[PDB]
């Protein structure tokens, strides 16, 4: 049950200067990378090519190679078309890919954001605006939908290519996706006193962290956000508010899939 994401970010500072960078995620692991400086798409995993042959990848990369150059000049022309309604700087983001389900089931998406706000999607056989989008976008939508060749290609990428590519990507990447990295915990106290239980280096993301006195769970436990490490593991800290002098007897218990029933209990 994984989500495949192609994240494109494009910045247009003025009429001339323009930049487009992309990253590809399968779940929470990066598979591809495409810097503006690079003519080619880079693999960040050994298995990023999936079950595609070299001829299949070259043909697919070339399509995107043409797209980046085309998209860049397209936007610039669309700005000219709407002037002076819209102007630089312009930020355009694309979130494309497909969500995988048990068996041969999937659902594909292609979402477009303009100035940090979701406005356009490809749905069915055409581009369309979503609820909340400005009306001026109806002309760009009308212009993009005129391009039958693009429409047929995008349909093929969403309906056929994405599901097939990721389905083969899960086979070649089974080893990395199902890896089990053990968490390591440590404790600290910050005056305000607040006890902090740091948990770092665990994979996958699902983890259970709670402050406890013996067999009693403490209700005041506040989990932070999941923070990433450089080595593609996760970091999380849980805070508990206590009166000074009541630290004794408290312990942090950590449950994770890698430990295998051997929960880390850290006493203060």
């Amino acid at each position: 049950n994984y989500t495949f994401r192609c994240l494109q970010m494009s910045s247009f500072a003025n009429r001339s200067w323009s930049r487009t960078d992309s990253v590809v995620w399968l779940g929470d692991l990066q598979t591809h990378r495409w810097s503006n400086d690079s003519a080619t798409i880079s693999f960040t995993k050994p298995w990023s090519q999936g079950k595609l042959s070299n001829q299949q990848w070259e043909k697919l990369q070339h399509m995107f190679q043409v797209y980046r150059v085309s998209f860049t000049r397209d936007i610039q022309e669309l700005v000219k078309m709407m002037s002076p309604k819209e102007d630089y700087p312009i930020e355009i983001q694309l979130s494309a890919g497909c969500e995988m389900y048990p068996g041969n089931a999937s659902e594909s998406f292609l979402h477009v954001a303009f100035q940090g706000k979701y406005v356009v999607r490809f749905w069915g056989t055409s581009w369309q605006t979503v609820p909340g989008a400005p009306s001026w976008l109806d002309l760009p939508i009308k212009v993009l939908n005129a391009d039958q060749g693009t429409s047929a290609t995008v349909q093929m990428l969403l309906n056929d290519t994405c599901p097939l590519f990721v389905r083969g990507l899960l086979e070649a990447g089974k080893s990395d996706l199902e890896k089990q990295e053990k968490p390591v915990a440590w404790l600290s106290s910050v005056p305000s006193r607040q006890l902090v239980c740091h948990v770092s280096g665990f994979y996958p993301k699902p983890v259970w962290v709670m402050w406890m006195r013996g067999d009693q769970e403490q209700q005041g436990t506040h989990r932070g956000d999941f923070l990433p490490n450089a080595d593609e593991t996760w970091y999380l800290q849980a805070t508990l508010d206590v009166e000074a002098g009541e630290e004794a007897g408290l312990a942090c218990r950590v449950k994770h899939s890698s430990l295998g029933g051997q929960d880390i209990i850290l006493y203060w």
Partner: T-cell receptor, first 113, second 111 residues
Framework: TQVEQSPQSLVVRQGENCVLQCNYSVTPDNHLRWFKQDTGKGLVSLTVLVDQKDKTSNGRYSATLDKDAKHSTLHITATLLDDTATYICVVGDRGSALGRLHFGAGTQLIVIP | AAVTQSPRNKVAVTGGKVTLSCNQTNNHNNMYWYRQDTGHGLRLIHYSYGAGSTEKGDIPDGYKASRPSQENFSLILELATPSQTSVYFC??????????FGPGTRLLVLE
């Protein structure tokens, strides 16, 4: 130049067949169009090629397009005097108004009646 | 989808103001100006995406464009030169790729 045409000049007798080549380097290549232009006149569209490997016909004109080879030919069957004109190859880089048209210098055809 | 050009032929002097105009009643948002010269295909000078809009083409130098309305698109030569002796084609189109061309305008700029 991104659009090249061959031959440059062409002299042919009435009733004879001729083929006109168009090679290009335009990226990307959405469609290819052939124009006919009488000496100092307008641009009359003869045909439009749109598919990866396309074939079109229009009376005595027939055309092909190979987008892997970036190449197009225009065949004129049984040439008449009125065919004496310049023939222009045009490539559009988009399937919409966002496209720029790339023009060939043309092929000059003279048909001897 | 008809497109007319006026004038169809013009003899002008160097330094004179020349206004080449074309009309289109097709309700097309987009209009384009090209020039044709021996040994070259048509080359884009200026184009428009609607009233008030003017955009530089591939060879805009020595030319000014004007789009006062949806119907009219004018190519203006403020200071004419003999190098601007050409055949000028105007074209219009909607969102599609098809550009509908006018009959052309012969211009000769003498010294």
């Amino acid at each position: 130049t991104q659009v090249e045409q061959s031959p440059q000049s062409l002299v042919v007798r009435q009733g004879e067949n001729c083929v006109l080549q168009c090679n290009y380097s335009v990226t990307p290549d959405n469609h290819l169009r052939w124009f006919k232009q009488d000496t100092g006149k307008g641009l009359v569209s003869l045909t439009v090629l749109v598919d990866q490997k396309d074939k079109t016909s229009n009376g005595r004109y027939s055309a092909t397009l190979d987008k892997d080879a970036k190449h197009s030919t225009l065949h004129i069957t049984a040439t008449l005097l009125d065919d004496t004109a310049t023939y222009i190859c045009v490539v559009g880089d988009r399937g919409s108004a966002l496209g720029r048209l790339h023009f060939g210098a043309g092929t000059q055809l003279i048909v001897i009646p | 989808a008809a497109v007319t050009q006026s004038p169809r032929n013009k003899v002008a002097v160097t330094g004179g103001k020349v206004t080449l105009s074309c009309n289109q009643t097709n309700n097309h948002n987009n209009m384009y100006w090209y020039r044709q010269d021996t040994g070259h295909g048509l080359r884009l000078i200026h184009y428009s995406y609607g009233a008030g809009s003017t955009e530089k083409g591939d060879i805009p130098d020595g030319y000014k464009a004007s789009r006062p309305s949806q119907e009219n698109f004018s190519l203006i030569l403020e200071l004419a030169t003999p190098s601007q002796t050409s055949v000028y084609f105007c074209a219009s189109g909607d969102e599609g790729y098809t550009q509908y061309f006018g009959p052309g305008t012969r211009l000769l700029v003498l010294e």
